[PDB]
């Protein structure tokens, strides 16, 4: 759950890129592996 | 800021909790021997008869001519 | 109610007494020095904090 | 905003996988609690067909491109590119290319339009102060991603020329030829507007002459391009590695000062001073103990936009808790 | 040479982004150092007799 | 040096050098992609950071091999500490290269040394040291031998491996100016090479047999 | 020691404190303070924080002499000489020297 008090949103972006990059064989696609980044907004969150 | 003043030291004994007020009173009797109000305040602070006896024994050794 | 007709004051021609209290309400004895000034040469704060 | 080879390539398996992932996430949320709409979402598949993994987070537009996967190239240091290396083996395994979101460049553009539209009857100093505030908020939030986004650099000099053009037509309605930058960029103490510049402003050698008379006579003198703001803001990657290593140094200095029973003074931690993402400055504040009970303050500063009509450019930070994350004294 | 702000696109090649970013020093290091020094030589009597209580110590009166 | 209590605060500071060993940074820029790759194992790097000094530079000769069926990567398997003394800007290693029967199975991959603080360039003293070692020892191939610099950044260590270009070996061989800015010293004299870390294998150390490695106090010896 | 059944189980710190007579506060000090990463500098400090020396105070009448030891003892002392642990540190090192 973000924004954390200890990281600004660009530190959130850096920690997220380095956290993607540090997953185990995350860029290996030889066996058919596929990463999927979903980004979304929980539409009408505050209203509903 | 005001050493050699018995009433500030008695206020300092009265406003602390008693176990650090004991160290306050020890500061006061380093600053002010021959001072009977600090020693009676030291006596009232300790809640056992043996320690009150020892403290007032030191008090009478310091200033012995106080009724 | 309409806007009042923008006449200026006749003016304060008498002073002291009530009028010093009239300004002591809102336009009182300010700093009048180093609060209304900008100090041409120096930068006293961090530069673009504003 | 990315090139066509740098976007997600819409191969059939990857498009079906992105839609399938989205459908799986969308079924878990009941439509009455919250919806997750495809049209406002973005699902980037990285696979054997798509070599780039893309996401817009926090106004940043990030494209991670692995070294194993369509680099084939020696790289020098580029600014918006984040060399992502592995934590255990320290090998650069991917590059995160940063950009600014088009909504964020549009927010900056609409902010400059709000400055200019409500300029009107205000002081030139207030228009340039609003420009400085919007420019510091943009430039200190988006630090490397501005230098990588050429559309934002074009937009930045367009908005800078728009602010300067409103100042110039507040001076004289006839638009000048060769207006001097010295009236904009001189600091407010020295009389000018104090405008921060994010664009190439070359000062002519004509604009640097000055005479001075005493009783031997008139002695003529001379002295260049105006400094840009990006050179005076530390990159975010530099900020995070120096924050990591400087709060590591604070941890060792703090345990050796607890060993020496004293407090950490200003003489140690003077090399660490404008450094750290919580700044080391924040250790030496009077209110610091009070700020140890201000939890959730960043979500609070984000939600200030629904309570305060004044738009906050530092919505993401606070001066109290993070310190001043920039320094424009030099 | 106009006074127009030109784009930095294409004009970043000799520069890095941290190039010319500076850090300030702590304001009034030596005044706070002198305050802390005077405080630590004034607190010598209190911190000298901090653990010494009038009741339970042997070298109180001496 | 101050030599009375400078070593006391330095000794105390060096007693906390194990805190630098979980904050290790590797400079992954300017790497030409066409050379060797170097896997320094984290156990000899941790031990090399702990036995060092924050001010005086220590140095160890790297020895290593290549993994099976990967000749373009060089697993450093050994750091040989030799009798050295070092100033804050150079290391005075002896003329004799490390000879032992355990280093016959491995090839000399250059040397590692600590720096007091991070420089973005290789030192001119380091390229003169590397090129004098190369000019006096034909087992030091200029393609494969490197200089890892473990610079002591705040609370951490930044590691950068450099290789000598054939311009740099010729200049450092002919060089005699031991200053910090000698004549004819260009940044084309070195190229940053890829160096990376490892939990997957362990290196070892070679100390001198009769004496120990640190001659910074025994400087006349 | 569980307060449920009242049973005691011996710890290896218990065996070491019983075998070498060091008090229970001293093994709690050596349990808090002994790390694998201790230098020879920190080892004299962990020794000097023993509860056997809880009554060792540094008196001012010897502080000058202690300074003449602290400039001559070969293992550095992180403490200041008017703290008692520095006194126990330099007294052990002045013994060995």
PDB file of C-alpha atoms in Angstrom, chain A residues 16 20 34-43, chain D residues 8 14-29 31 34-46 52-58 61-62:
ATOM      1  CA  UNK A  16       9.521  -1.289  -8.277  1.00  0.00           C
ATOM      2  CA  UNK A  20      10.933  -6.451 -11.119  1.00  0.00           C
ATOM      3  CA  UNK A  34       6.046 -14.170 -19.923  1.00  0.00           C
ATOM      4  CA  UNK A  35       5.968 -11.293 -17.505  1.00  0.00           C
ATOM      5  CA  UNK A  36       2.802  -9.202 -17.487  1.00  0.00           C
ATOM      6  CA  UNK A  37       2.614  -5.746 -15.937  1.00  0.00           C
ATOM      7  CA  UNK A  38      -0.943  -4.643 -15.238  1.00  0.00           C
ATOM      8  CA  UNK A  39      -1.641  -1.079 -14.186  1.00  0.00           C
ATOM      9  CA  UNK A  40      -5.128   0.094 -13.311  1.00  0.00           C
ATOM     10  CA  UNK A  41      -7.078   2.552 -11.264  1.00  0.00           C
ATOM     11  CA  UNK A  42      -9.984   0.820  -9.400  1.00  0.00           C
ATOM     12  CA  UNK A  43     -12.517   2.827 -11.399  1.00  0.00           C
TER      13      UNK A  43
ATOM     14  CA  UNK D   8       4.297  -3.244 -26.498  1.00  0.00           C
ATOM     15  CA  UNK D  14       0.728 -11.491 -25.895  1.00  0.00           C
ATOM     16  CA  UNK D  15      -2.444  -9.510 -26.562  1.00  0.00           C
ATOM     17  CA  UNK D  16      -4.546 -12.500 -25.504  1.00  0.00           C
ATOM     18  CA  UNK D  17      -2.389 -12.883 -22.408  1.00  0.00           C
ATOM     19  CA  UNK D  18      -2.736  -9.233 -21.464  1.00  0.00           C
ATOM     20  CA  UNK D  19      -6.503  -9.351 -21.909  1.00  0.00           C
ATOM     21  CA  UNK D  20      -6.606 -12.666 -20.026  1.00  0.00           C
ATOM     22  CA  UNK D  21      -4.598 -11.279 -17.108  1.00  0.00           C
ATOM     23  CA  UNK D  22      -6.886  -8.265 -17.030  1.00  0.00           C
ATOM     24  CA  UNK D  23     -10.004 -10.429 -17.153  1.00  0.00           C
ATOM     25  CA  UNK D  24      -8.669 -12.570 -14.306  1.00  0.00           C
ATOM     26  CA  UNK D  25      -8.012  -9.479 -12.189  1.00  0.00           C
ATOM     27  CA  UNK D  26     -11.392  -7.987 -13.132  1.00  0.00           C
ATOM     28  CA  UNK D  27     -13.340 -11.067 -12.029  1.00  0.00           C
ATOM     29  CA  UNK D  28     -11.854 -10.910  -8.540  1.00  0.00           C
ATOM     30  CA  UNK D  29     -13.366  -7.495  -7.942  1.00  0.00           C
ATOM     31  CA  UNK D  31     -18.503  -4.740 -10.197  1.00  0.00           C
ATOM     32  CA  UNK D  34     -15.088  -1.305  -7.710  1.00  0.00           C
ATOM     33  CA  UNK D  35     -14.603  -1.728 -11.410  1.00  0.00           C
ATOM     34  CA  UNK D  36     -11.306  -2.040 -13.229  1.00  0.00           C
ATOM     35  CA  UNK D  37     -11.840  -0.755 -16.770  1.00  0.00           C
ATOM     36  CA  UNK D  38      -9.723  -1.835 -19.721  1.00  0.00           C
ATOM     37  CA  UNK D  39      -9.821   1.600 -21.325  1.00  0.00           C
ATOM     38  CA  UNK D  40      -8.164   3.306 -18.351  1.00  0.00           C
ATOM     39  CA  UNK D  41      -5.762   0.418 -17.706  1.00  0.00           C
ATOM     40  CA  UNK D  42      -2.576  -0.716 -19.361  1.00  0.00           C
ATOM     41  CA  UNK D  43      -1.399  -4.317 -19.491  1.00  0.00           C
ATOM     42  CA  UNK D  44       2.099  -4.732 -20.926  1.00  0.00           C
ATOM     43  CA  UNK D  45       3.260  -8.235 -21.644  1.00  0.00           C
ATOM     44  CA  UNK D  46       6.970  -8.980 -21.775  1.00  0.00           C
ATOM     45  CA  UNK D  52      10.147  -4.207 -23.439  1.00  0.00           C
ATOM     46  CA  UNK D  53       8.095  -4.160 -20.260  1.00  0.00           C
ATOM     47  CA  UNK D  54       6.167  -0.924 -19.929  1.00  0.00           C
ATOM     48  CA  UNK D  55       4.309   0.807 -17.119  1.00  0.00           C
ATOM     49  CA  UNK D  56       3.197   4.265 -16.093  1.00  0.00           C
ATOM     50  CA  UNK D  57       3.590   4.585 -12.356  1.00  0.00           C
ATOM     51  CA  UNK D  58       3.473   7.793 -10.312  1.00  0.00           C
ATOM     52  CA  UNK D  61       6.622   6.297 -17.875  1.00  0.00           C
ATOM     53  CA  UNK D  62       9.027   3.407 -17.444  1.00  0.00           C
TER      54      UNK D  62
END
